[PDB]
Amino acid sequence: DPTIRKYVQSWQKLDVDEQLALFWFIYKEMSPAIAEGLFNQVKELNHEQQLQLQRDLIRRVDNQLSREYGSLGDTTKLLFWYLLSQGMDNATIVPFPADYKLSSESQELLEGIKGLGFEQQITLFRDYVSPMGA
Ligand SMILES: CC1=C(/C=C/C(C)=C/C=C/C(C)=C/C=C/C=C(C)/C=C/C=C(C)/C=C/C2=C(C)CCCC2(C)C)C(C)(C)CCC1
Q1: Within 13 Å of residue 19, how many CA atoms lie on the same side as its CB?
Q2: Closest residue CA from atom 13 of ligand 1
Q3: Domain ranges of the chain
Q4: Does the beta carbon of 20 sit less than 6 angstroms from any atom of ligand 1?
Q5: Which of 79, 56, 32 is nearest to 132 (CA)?
Q6: 70 membership: H or E segment, kind and range
Q7: What topology is assigned to 1-134 in CATH?
Q8: Cα 66 to the center of its chain, rounded Å
Q9: Are 39 and 82 in contact (CB under 8 A)?
Q10: Is any atom of ligand 1 closer than 6 Å to the C-beta of 85?
Q11: How far is ligand 1, taken at its centre, from the CA of residue 134, in Å?
Q12: Which residue out of 16, 22, 23 has the highest number of ligand 1 atoms within 8 Å of its CB and is therefore the one to mutate?
């Protein structure tokens, strides 16, 4: 389980967009009210602002939405990130680009994360999204 922190640290060394790409592809290889609430504030924005929030959450930017995120529990935070992925498959959230290919480093992490067990993956994801926001 020290290997989980290494995934988190490796994940946190990538570019912000690279991080979001890795998170999205993992989603393709696979408290709710509070999450649905924050999720509504997201899809109520313009598609561009939807992108800037997710970046701002990874960058720990200090704004109102990041503060709300940062004030939630780990479970809610991860559920929020799930509803974002669902909102993207349903075209509710700004879509993901087809022509994006993962860096050599990212594809290594992904296959490495494909090796972990479902519960270690959940543990990984919770720790990755837990310190985001403000
Ligand atoms: C590419 C790019 C972009 C974008 C991107 C994005 C936007 C992404 C996103 C991504 C995402 C948005 C992702 C997500 C993910 C999610 C996930 C991965 C989730 C998971 C979850 C889970 C795992 C859960 C579990 C559970 C529950 C539900 C609760 C408790 C119990 C259990 C455990 C069952 C742009 C446009 C700028 C362009 C350039 C770059």
Answers
A1: 22
A2: 24
A3: 1-134
A4: yes
A5: 56
A6: helix 64-70
A7: orange carotenoid protein, domain 2 (1.10.2090)
A8: 13
A9: no
A10: yes
A11: 19
A12: 23
